[PDB]
Amino acid sequence: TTLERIEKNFVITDPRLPDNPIIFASDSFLQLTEYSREEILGRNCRFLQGPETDRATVRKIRDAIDNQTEVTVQLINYTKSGKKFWNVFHLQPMRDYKGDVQYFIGVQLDGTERLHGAAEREAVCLIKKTAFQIAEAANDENYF
């Protein structure tokens, strides 16, 4: 139940810094994407995007960041070696006591296909629970 013990794909970014960089990436995220921490810490997550990534879906994420709201989408992402995967992606802002966004949590559920129906429902339920758990752990450890 510790932040570093959560065995899920996620990053935490700081939108009060230039270009909303990654300030924490989970071990699972590194294994999934094949990047190491000296490669992606302090960088924006958009390195996951590539030729087949749908630009309109990316705009939805952009808008949600600009508006400081949550969002859930499915989109194609790329590992460092350039292999494609489908990503059910959930963005969850982390607000302090007065409602200022301190960080964004980003959770990735990787797969080989875009999901529909009950399988999409399941995936979305899962990543939204994971984001809740991350937010609680980070706060309980005064991690950031």
Ligand X SMILES: Cc1cc2nc3c(=O)[nH]c(=O)nc-3n(C[C@H](O)[C@H](O)[C@H](O)COP(=O)(O)O)c2cc1C
75-96: burial string, b at 16+ Cβ within 10 Å, e else:
bbbbeeeeeebbbbbbbbbbee
The contact mask relative to ligand X for 30-49 (x = CB under 6 A, - = no) is: --------------xxx-xx
Q: For the chain, where are the E strands, in sequence order?
A: 9-13, 22-25, 71-78, 84-95, 101-111
Lookup result for tokens 């006591």: 97
Instruction: Please list the helix, strand and coil fractions of the chain in percent, rounded to the nearest 5, in that order.
Output: 40, 30, 35
Binding mask 72-101 for ligand X (x = CB under 6 A): ---x-x---------x-x-x----------
Q: Measured from the CB of residue 125, what is the shortest distance to ligand X in angstroms?
A: 18
Q: Is 75 annotated as a binding residue?
A: no
Considering the rule CB under 6 A, would residue 102 count as an interface residue with ligand X?
Answer: no
Instruction: Tell me how far, at minimum, the Cβ of 121 lies from ligand X, in Å.
Output: 20
Specify the stretch interacting with ligand X by CB under 6 A; choose among 55-63, 93-101, 122-130, 134-142.
55-63
Q: Which is nearer to ligand X, 62 or 129 (CB)?
A: 62
Q: State which of residues 13, 26, 72, 130 lies at the interface with ligand X (CB under 6 A).
A: 13
Cα–Cα nearest to 48, from 102, 86, 91: 86
Across the beta sheet with 9-13, the strand order is: 22-25, 9-13, 101-111, 84-95, 71-78
Binding-site residue ranges: 38, 41, 44-46, 49, 62, 77, 87, 100, 108, 110
